Design an enzyme around this catalytic site. Sequence first.
Site, PDB file in Angstrom:
ATOM      1  N   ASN A 187     -18.392  -2.085 -40.104  1.00 27.08           N
ATOM      2  CA  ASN A 187     -18.813  -1.571 -41.424  1.00 27.08           C
ATOM      3  C   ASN A 187     -18.548  -0.073 -41.429  1.00 27.08           C
ATOM      4  O   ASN A 187     -19.294   0.650 -40.779  1.00 27.08           O
ATOM      5  CB  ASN A 187     -20.273  -1.903 -41.702  1.00 27.08           C
ATOM      6  CG  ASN A 187     -20.754  -1.323 -43.007  1.00 27.08           C
ATOM      7  OD1 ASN A 187     -19.956  -0.857 -43.821  1.00 27.08           O
ATOM      8  ND2 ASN A 187     -22.064  -1.363 -43.200  1.00 27.08           N
ATOM      9  N   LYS A 219     -18.920   1.906 -43.829  1.00 26.34           N
ATOM     10  CA  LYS A 219     -19.857   2.543 -44.788  1.00 26.34           C
ATOM     11  C   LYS A 219     -19.094   3.509 -45.702  1.00 26.34           C
ATOM     12  O   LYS A 219     -17.897   3.294 -45.943  1.00 26.34           O
ATOM     13  CB  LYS A 219     -21.003   3.207 -44.018  1.00 26.34           C
ATOM     14  CG  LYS A 219     -21.711   2.275 -43.043  1.00 26.34           C
ATOM     15  CD  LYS A 219     -23.045   2.783 -42.565  1.00 26.34           C
ATOM     16  CE  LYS A 219     -23.696   1.806 -41.605  1.00 26.34           C
ATOM     17  NZ  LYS A 219     -24.994   2.327 -41.140  1.00 26.34           N
ATOM     18  N   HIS A 232     -26.648  -5.500 -47.299  1.00 26.14           N
ATOM     19  CA  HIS A 232     -26.807  -4.476 -46.247  1.00 26.14           C
ATOM     20  C   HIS A 232     -28.118  -3.722 -46.491  1.00 26.14           C
ATOM     21  O   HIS A 232     -28.467  -3.470 -47.667  1.00 26.14           O
ATOM     22  CB  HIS A 232     -25.628  -3.512 -46.227  1.00 26.14           C
ATOM     23  CG  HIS A 232     -25.619  -2.681 -44.998  1.00 26.14           C
ATOM     24  ND1 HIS A 232     -26.371  -1.525 -44.882  1.00 26.14           N
ATOM     25  CD2 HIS A 232     -24.996  -2.861 -43.814  1.00 26.14           C
ATOM     26  CE1 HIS A 232     -26.182  -1.023 -43.674  1.00 26.14           C
ATOM     27  NE2 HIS A 232     -25.341  -1.810 -43.004  1.00 26.14           N
ATOM     28  N   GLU A 259     -28.956  -0.740 -46.345  1.00 24.84           N
ATOM     29  CA  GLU A 259     -28.833   0.514 -47.131  1.00 24.84           C
ATOM     30  C   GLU A 259     -28.849   0.161 -48.618  1.00 24.84           C
ATOM     31  O   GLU A 259     -29.423   0.932 -49.385  1.00 24.84           O
ATOM     32  CB  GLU A 259     -27.578   1.282 -46.732  1.00 24.84           C
ATOM     33  CG  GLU A 259     -27.696   1.904 -45.359  1.00 24.84           C
ATOM     34  CD  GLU A 259     -26.388   2.125 -44.620  1.00 24.84           C
ATOM     35  OE1 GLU A 259     -25.275   1.954 -45.221  1.00 24.84           O
ATOM     36  OE2 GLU A 259     -26.487   2.459 -43.442  1.00 24.84           O
ATOM     37  N   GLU A 284     -30.219  -6.847 -39.073  1.00 29.32           N
ATOM     38  CA  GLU A 284     -30.316  -5.383 -38.905  1.00 29.32           C
ATOM     39  C   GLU A 284     -31.740  -5.013 -38.534  1.00 29.32           C
ATOM     40  O   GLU A 284     -32.659  -5.160 -39.345  1.00 29.32           O
ATOM     41  CB  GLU A 284     -29.937  -4.673 -40.199  1.00 29.32           C
ATOM     42  CG  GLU A 284     -28.542  -5.017 -40.694  1.00 29.32           C
ATOM     43  CD  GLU A 284     -28.270  -4.261 -41.978  1.00 29.32           C
ATOM     44  OE1 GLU A 284     -28.051  -3.052 -41.884  1.00 29.32           O
ATOM     45  OE2 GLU A 284     -28.437  -4.859 -43.082  1.00 29.32           O
ATOM     46  N   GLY A 343     -32.899   5.014 -37.056  1.00 30.07           N
ATOM     47  CA  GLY A 343     -33.272   6.358 -37.544  1.00 30.07           C
ATOM     48  C   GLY A 343     -34.729   6.715 -37.296  1.00 30.07           C
ATOM     49  O   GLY A 343     -35.157   7.775 -37.780  1.00 30.07           O
ATOM     50  N   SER A 351     -27.891  -0.826 -33.347  1.00 29.28           N
ATOM     51  CA  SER A 351     -27.031   0.176 -32.675  1.00 29.28           C
ATOM     52  C   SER A 351     -26.209  -0.547 -31.612  1.00 29.28           C
ATOM     53  O   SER A 351     -26.780  -1.064 -30.639  1.00 29.28           O
ATOM     54  CB  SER A 351     -27.827   1.320 -32.092  1.00 29.28           C
ATOM     55  OG  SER A 351     -26.947   2.361 -31.680  1.00 29.28           O
TER      56      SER A 351
END
Lengths: 249, 249
Positions: free
Chosen positions: A9, A11, A95, A97, A165, A171, A211
Amino acid sequence: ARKFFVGGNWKANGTAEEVKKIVNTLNEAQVPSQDVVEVVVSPPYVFLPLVKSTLRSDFFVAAQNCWVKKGGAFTGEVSAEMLVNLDIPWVILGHSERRAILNESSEFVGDKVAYALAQGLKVIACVGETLEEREAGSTMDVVAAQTKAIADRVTNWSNVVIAYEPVWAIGTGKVASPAQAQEVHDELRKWLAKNVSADVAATTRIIYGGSVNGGNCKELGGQADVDGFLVGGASLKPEFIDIIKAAEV
Amino acid sequence: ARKFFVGGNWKANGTAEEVKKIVNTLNEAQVPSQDVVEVVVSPPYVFLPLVKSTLRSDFFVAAQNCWVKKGGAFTGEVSAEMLVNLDIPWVILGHSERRAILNESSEFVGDKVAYALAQGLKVIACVGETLEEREAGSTMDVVAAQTKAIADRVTNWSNVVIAYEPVWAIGTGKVASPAQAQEVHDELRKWLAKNVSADVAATTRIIYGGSVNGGNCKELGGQADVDGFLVGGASLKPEFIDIIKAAEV
Ligand code: NA
Ligand code: NA
């Protein structure tokens, strides 16, 4: 056996010059056979024609999103039938995000998955829980709810890959162990077995969208219920090749 | 005098074959001089490279949207700097369909306009009120609020065109008169004069984004405060040429 699956991906990243370098690096890559790994690369919309026209025919191209239904008066949106017209075989849907930042609901994502499959696209359907959700004990409540919204709208799972995910580890300063990835993949596969069918659970790839790097890809890939990866940042880099090579025996 | 401006918003429509036909039709078109009309065409993201590479150099290309800020971890989004890299000079921002269907707030749109201008893009910034808003007596309250969110975030208006969309007349059975278009354009220009400057009001194109066709383009174009059009469906058709020709003396 489920064929190992590595998605990259990109992004919201890339320039014509950097895309040409990335494609040239993938074209020169020497990876396991098409019998042991399926490789998908996902550039921004504006680079889909460049990548599809220049990428090695044994790697596949995905859009990062598409519209929920037939095109028309949806300024800014790209329809599944546009992707099919451009011979783009895959799409990433739901996704984390888009769910978090663009407020895509589980039902909206489910509708997209159904429409994309109806138009002949193959779908990487993404699910995953936030740190707040995991710390509240809601991991499988959330992942099951997200998956259910898709499952309620899907009659054929042949062209679906599920990506888990661990948003809680992306983060936050929290790190997911291979054991933690395996636990969610196992519980999610068990959910598919009970709520869809034993066949669908046994044959659907569930890929890890946490990750992923050259350091951790082999231990993650070797987990009983991890069938590959949806890679983030490393997908722009030569390191993506090392992650594809996690498929090797 | 403000240079007449005709934008064509293709929306979520097109195939490689249809884009080639549309571009071939625009390339063969014979329209007023570059001194009297500025023409912008806005395809879906996936067709921006095809259109930019094949369209006559005196017509300009716009994206239908871009991201609010610098690219990165925004799966599915296209950054202003991606458009600049692909030599796409224009972007449509805050289209009524994105405000209504994708829930883009006035502040979100304002942030996009500021970021796009900062990266060197030219912006078609869209505003407009719904039927409920117009029937409530809120037309100029809504249009002023939407414009203010942009104006509060913009220091240079040279590369802005404002498009007024009478959303109240788009799909409702209500029809906007040229007099009704003129009234909103005049009130909006007066608002710019008081809230930004007399210069900015006198020099900023305010284009009409309602139903535009060969039948109504000359009467709408001749209104004192209408500086051109943001065309919908007709932008896919040879009729788009007749709308560009509304610029003629
Ligand atoms: Na495995
Ligand atoms: Na006029």
